[PDB]
RNA sequence: GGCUCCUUGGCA
RNA sequence: GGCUCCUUGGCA
RNA sequence: GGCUCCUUGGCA
RNA sequence: GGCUCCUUGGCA
RNA sequence: GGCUCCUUGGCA
RNA sequence: GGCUCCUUGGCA
RNA sequence: GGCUCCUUGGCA
RNA sequence: GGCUCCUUGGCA
RNA sequence: GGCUCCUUGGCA
RNA sequence: GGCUCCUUGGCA
RNA sequence: GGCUCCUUGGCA
RNA sequence: GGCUCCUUGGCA
RNA sequence: GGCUCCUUGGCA
RNA sequence: GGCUCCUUGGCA
RNA sequence: GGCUCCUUGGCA
RNA sequence: GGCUCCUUGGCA
RNA sequence: GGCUCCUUGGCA
RNA sequence: GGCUCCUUGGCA
RNA sequence: GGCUCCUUGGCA
RNA sequence: GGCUCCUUGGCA
């Protein structure tokens, strides 16, 4: 239902700081949850599942997105762009979201919010290409 | 352009006193998070953090002297680090705009804590500066 | 025999419309006969005799029923109640029906049919009182 | 509650066009015969009859125009009077429920005459209304 | 017959206000009857009998319901819940309703209406337990 | 959130002027009956009732002055108490949203009585407020 | 949008030096652009179009302004006044500016800046008369 | 009034050495651009330019001698022409205010180029003048 | 050198 | 060593 | 970037 | 979204 | 909802 | 038509 | 007879 | 009527 | 109308 | 305009 | 001193 | 000080 | 002292 | 909570 | 509940 | 020969 | 055909 | 799509 | 954005 | 920018 957006925001913060600060994912999860004053169970558990599905499988995801960068190493992107793409790939593919378009909207929203419009368009294009590659992979 | 630099430096010093890691990496992190564009803000904030880190023990002594008997370790991270930054710029960088420094610092205190801590930091800073004037 | 009920129905319609519409009794008789598709001679002639015995003697009848209304003017009743009482008095008294109870049953039936149950009980009571007054001159 | 009112009004108009007496007395007669209980049915039917009687000649003209050349006097009493009522309510009372008016009227035609007259009255009424739409 | 529901509603209002406002039961009965525009005799008299059977016997009833609250004092419930339970016990037990299920339906309906769903479920459970205790008192 | 508070206060004042019991208990009763959830509505309505009860005689005087010669005791409970509440909030609480107060009050009058009383209360309230503007 | 003022300044320099130094318009354009450190494309192209529209049509313009000098030969004016009037006529008439008043403000500003107040008033009056003559063909 | 005349003359000589056109026309252009009002400034600057143009080759020789082996064609236009003007006024016009000439010239060098060229021109000019003193 | 001041050059 | 006003030019 | 005025759309 | 409002309903 | 009075269907 | 119910319709 | 909620539409 | 979010262009 | 900004000059 | 530090003038 | 016309700073 | 204004800090 | 827009978070 | 769209049932 | 309707009845 | 009411079922 | 009450889940 | 709401921030 | 009250600047 | 002053600079 509705908790999904908040869960995605939390997960994005956790991944962003995990990449940037190199701190433990669980500890950063505690930090983000405490500072955001998260209470409701669904959002908490969904965010935890998102973060866990992002951390486990991280390299597979990195490879997946690095395939669509046209030979460009993933460190050549922005922190926001990169991590948001990671979360997006995790949710869309690894958890097989039944609401792909919704995930697109929310993710792109997060990218616009934390970075800017152009980053949003970039992430949108890349992730769209990735999902187009995924859906017809079967 | 100095205000944002002061906010930066404050956050960096805060994370240093909290986590305990290397100030440079923390600086990189804070800079990355707030998206610092302007060059002067970067340079300035960096100079602030460096100045604070080099003189840190002397700064702590100067602050503790005006704490009215308190141990500096017992202050809140916000008050303590804001006082650190304030003393750093006012004394060791010899800021030619002390009033503005007081402004920015106290405002920072009121942002990340209650105004109750704001007037306190203002008072301690005032005492420290008044002592610094008659020092030399 | 059997034609009596139909004759009574026809006569009742004729009287009801005579009182209500103020139209000529003979013309209304033609109307009712034509619209009911009456054919059989006995019913036709019996209905005609009923209507004629109702029209001639009408005021005498009105007085008779008005005696049993306990001072109440006859216009204070319903059209159905009034006219049915008129027909009933005509048949019972003026033609001296040899089948009084039968006339009662049929008349009360007509009253229930064209108005309602309570009107039927009312007409029944009134007409019964009238006939009780009529039979004992002895 | 409108249906019974329409049946009432139809019977009244019919007896008016037939006998030729005063519409009010006829209305009283019809009301007495069918035993009208509800107030709204009475009021409504009365308004219908009044509206029809006031505008009667104009109504006859409007109807006759769509008769395809026929004289309105040559129509059956049922068809003619039902058309009268229909035109009265649809046009002069500006009914906001035209479809329902068509329904009730045509049904009335099918009750007191064959459906053969029903489709006819439906057609004439449809033509009249379609003309009324583009009138103003 | 049908007047029972209305009677129960009236009685419930009277009890609710009797408990809340502390005003005289008869006066409040007059108030509720006047404001609801109650006319029909059966509803009036039935409501009066319900209220009277509720007021007289009130403490006995209170004890009865307080037995099933598992040691919980009756003032710990809501006004609606409490008073509706009082009326329910009065009707089911003291007047020995021959239509227990009907009383259940109507009472629970009143509880849902004046409070909420959960209050309805609560009252339902409690009253059901009470009636289960009553029927096998034989 | 103010509207429900005004309805509350109105009902409370009404029951006070009617029964004559203690306003606090009546307030508890009304609050219990309407199931007030929100805190601000409770607090507000309570402040309204208190303000009205404290200043009640002065309020009655102010209202009676604009009644055009009538005795305030001769007004309907609805009109009288609604005027009481209106004057209380508009004058003694110095409401910064007078138009909205007029709205809510007049609406309350139209709910528990005819609109005929509504325009009247609106007029009296308008006169009172216009007088209050030029008072100080 | 905003580039217009800068374009007008550049054009004015080019015309002033074209009249004074007699050097090639394109070369002087290169000089002014290089020395002003002009980069943004809109300003560059707009200035180029202004200069080109001034050079081509130059004699027509000269005649136009010479009509409003009341028989006075155009060489009797100042360099600033003359050339600014040329640019003004070019922009207002030949390019048909949709922002005439704006052009007036900027041109008069340039005249005040490079010469003095009185020159500004003079140019203002003359150019205003010219535009008044231009706008009314009917 | 001499300073502006020197700036004028410098610009004129510069444009001469750059473009290669006739010094008189260039003088007219520069005078027109800077809006020279005062008569003495005009006359003076004109005398400076004329004196420089007449003696130009001798001036170039004198300058080149003190260049420490450099070709005069390899100097920046600013340094070269400022030196030209300086030598012209100091030597051929026999200025009675040499210090002031040094001032104005060096300042002109610092305006249209970096001070790095300023000290250089000052040095060369000093050498040239010191040589001129012992010449006769 | 004890007063009131003014113009002005270089310079952190 | 720190500013004021303003001009031109580059971008949010 | 911030404020504000229209204007072409999709709106709440 | 959201007030006044001339009009027709829907649910209870 | 609540209130006033009358039908229909079906079950005893 | 003695009398209970279920589901609906219309109604001041 | 009197309420709660809500939809469409006519006008500012 | 008042309030407002975006979007296509042009302004203070 | 404003503000910041990457550059270069005139005035105090 | 302030201002740090060396100057040059010159007025009552 | 006197005379002709233009700046700068600061105060209303 | 009589006009047109702009930037901006603290504050109920 | 009363708002606008928006972000996050808790619930109907 | 309000509107609305499907969907699994019991329905009127 | 509730219209059209191809079909079979029931009651009167 | 023609009406009132009502049940089941075929189709939108 | 149109209207509608609840209920199991998923949406704007 | 909306509204209210228990919390905390950015913009005007 | 409004706004109460003390300010600082600065433009024609 | 309406208009008064104070102190200076340059100038036929």
Q: DSSP states of H15-49 as a string?
A: HHHHH---HHHHHHHHHHHHT---HHHHHHHHHHH
Tokens of D131: 């003309």
Residue nearest J2 (alpha carbon to C1'): B96
Residues of H in contact with G79 (CB under 8 A): 32
D19 strand X contact, CB < 7 Å:
no
Using CA atoms, how far apart are residues D58 and D66, in angstroms rounded to an integer?
Answer: 13
H partners (3+ CB pairs within 8 A) are G
Nearest CA in chain A to B35: A115
Strand Q at less than 7 A from CB of B70 = no
Cα angle G68-G73-G75, degrees, rounded to a multiple of 5: 115
- The DSSP secondary structure of D35-82, one letter per residue, reads T---HHHHHHHHHHHHHHHHTHHHHHHHHHHTTTT--GGGS-HHHHHH
DSSP state of H93: S
Q: Which CA-bearing residue is nearest the C1' of Z4?
A: F1
The region that residue G24 occupies, defined by phi over 0 for left and psi between -120 and 50 for alpha, beta otherwise, is beta
Residue H118's contacts (CB-CB under 8 Å, 6 or more residues apart) are H106, H107, H109, H110
The three-point CA angle A6-A8-A10 to 5° equals 70
Task: Give A25: exposed, middle or buried? Use CB within 10 Å, 0-12, 13-18, 19+.
Answer: middle
Q: Give the CA H20 to C1' I8 distance in Å.
A: 40
In the G/H pair of chains, how many CB contacts fall below 8 A?
Answer: 6
Collapsing DSSP to helix, strand or coil, E24 comes out as: coil
How buried is residue C91: exposed, middle or buried, by Cβ count under 10 Å (0-12/13-18/19+)? buried
**With 0-12 CB in 10 A as exposed, 13-18 as middle and 19+ as buried, what is G88?**
buried
Contact A25, A51 (CB under 8 A): yes
Interatomic distance G12 CA / Y1 C1' (Å): 79
- Chain G hits for H32, CB-CB cut-off 8 Å, are 20, 79
- CA angle, corner G114, sides to G110 and G117, nearest 5? 80
Disruptive mutation site among G20, G75, G78 for chain H (greatest number of H CBs within 10 Å): G20
Counting beta carbons within 10 angstroms of the beta carbon of residue H130, is it exposed (0 to 12), middle (13 to 18) or buried (19 or more)?
exposed
Which residues 6+ apart lie within 8 Å of B37 measured at CB? none
Q: Is C79 within 8 Å of D32 when comparing Cβ atoms?
A: yes
B40's CB contacts (< 8 A; 6+ apart) are B1, B5
Show residues of chain C in contact with D29, CB under 8 Å.
20-21
Judged by C1' against the alpha carbon of D114, the nearest nucleotide is X2
Break-preceding residues in chain G (C–N over 2.5 Å): none
Q: Tell me, letter by letter, the H, E, C secondary structure of C35-89.
A: HHCCCCHHHHHHHHHHHHHHHCCHHHHHHHHHHCCCCCCHHHCCHHHHHHHHHHH
Q: Which nucleotide is nearest to G117 (CA to C1')?
A: AB1
A 10 A CB-CB count for F26 gives: 21
Cα–Cα distance measured from residue D41 to residue G56, given in angstroms and rounded to the nearest whole number? 90
Tokens of D70: 């026929």
Rounded distance in angstroms from the CA atom of residue H129 to the C1' atom of nucleotide AA8: 54
Tell whether the torsion through CA atoms of D28, D30, D31 and D33 is positive or negative. positive
- What is the C-alpha separation between E62 and E74, in angstroms, rounded? 7
E34 is near strand O: CB distance < 7 Å: no
Separation between the CA of A130 and the C1’ of V12 (whole angstroms): 51
List the H97 CA – I7 C1' distance (angstroms): 20
Cβ–Cβ < 8 Å for G61, G90 = yes
Shortest distance between the Cα of F127 and any Cα of chain E, in A, equals: 34
Residues 6 or more apart whose Cβ sits within 8 Å of residue C86: C15, C54, C58, C61, C62, C65
B29–A79 C-beta distance less than 8 A: no
Neighbour subunits, D (≥3 Cβ pairs < 8 A): C
Place of tokens 């009050």: F105
Q: After which residues is chain B broken (C to N over 2.5 A)?
A: none
> Using an 8 Å Cβ cutoff, are A94 and A49 in contact?
no
Q: Is the CB of H107 under 7 A from strand I?
A: yes
Q: Set out the domains of chain C in order of their start, with CATH numbers.
A: 1-138 (1.10.940.10)
The residues close to strand N, meaning Cβ under 7 A, are: D 1, 38-40; E 1, 99, 102
Q: How far H29 CA lies from chain G's nearest CA (Å)?
A: 7
- In sequence order, what are the residues at sequence separation of 6 or more whose Cβ sits closer than 8 angstroms to the Cβ of residue D68? none
Q: Is the CB of G99 under 7 A from strand P?
A: yes
Solving technique for this entry? X-ray
- Per the structure, the residue whose CA is closest to nucleotide W12 at C1' is C113
- Our CA-based measurement puts residue E114 at a distance from the nearest CA of chain F, in whole angstroms, of 9
Listed as ranges, the nucleotides of chain N within 7 A of a protein C-beta are: 4-6, 10-12
Tell which residue, G36, G24, G94, G26, has the closest CA to residue G10.
Answer: G36
Chains A and B touch (3+ CB pairs under 8 A): yes
């Amino acid at each position: 239902m509705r908790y999904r957006k908040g869960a995605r925001d939390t997960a994005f913060l956790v991944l962003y700081r995990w990449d940037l600060r190199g701190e433990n994912p669980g500890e950063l999860f505690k930090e983000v949850v405490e500072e955001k004053n998260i209470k409701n169970k669904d959002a908490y558990e969904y965010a935890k599942k998102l973060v866990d599905t992002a951390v486990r499988h991280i390299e597979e995801i990195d490879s997946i997105i690095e395939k669509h960068l046209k030979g460009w190493s993933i460190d050549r992107l922005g922190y926001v762009e990169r991590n948001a793409l990671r979360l997006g790939v995790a949710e869309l593919i690894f958890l097989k979201s039944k609401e792909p378009g919704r995930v697109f909207i929310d993710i792109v929203d997060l990218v616009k919010k934390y970075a800017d419009e152009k980053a949003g368009k970039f992430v949108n294009g890349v992730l769209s290409a990735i999902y187009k590659a995924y859906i017809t992979s079967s």
